Amino acid sequence: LGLLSYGAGVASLPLLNVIA
Protein backbone atom coordinates (compact mmCIF):
# COMPACT_ATOMS: atom_id res chain seq x y z
CA LEU A 1 0.00 0.00 0.00
CA GLY A 2 2.84 2.36 0.87
CA LEU A 3 4.62 1.52 -2.36
CA LEU A 4 1.45 2.21 -4.34
CA SER A 5 1.12 5.65 -2.74
CA TYR A 6 4.81 6.19 -3.50
CA GLY A 7 3.94 7.72 -6.88
CA ALA A 8 3.96 4.84 -9.36
CA GLY A 9 0.89 6.43 -10.93
CA VAL A 10 -1.47 7.58 -8.18
CA ALA A 11 -2.53 10.66 -10.16
CA SER A 12 -1.58 9.04 -13.46
CA LEU A 13 -4.49 6.59 -13.13
CA PRO A 14 -7.54 8.66 -11.95
CA LEU A 15 -7.06 11.29 -14.65
CA LEU A 16 -6.29 8.63 -17.25
CA ASN A 17 -9.40 6.67 -16.27
CA VAL A 18 -11.61 9.71 -16.81
CA ILE A 19 -10.06 10.39 -20.21
CA ALA A 20 -10.23 6.70 -21.11
Experimental method: NMR
Give the C-alpha separation, 3 to 7, whole Å.
Answer: 8
* CA-to-CA separations, 5 to 19, 20, in angstroms, rounded: 21, 22
* CA-to-CA separations, 6 to 1, 3, 11, 19, 20, in angstroms, rounded: 9, 5, 11, 23, 23
HEC readout, 1-20: CCCHHHHCCCCCCHHHHHHC
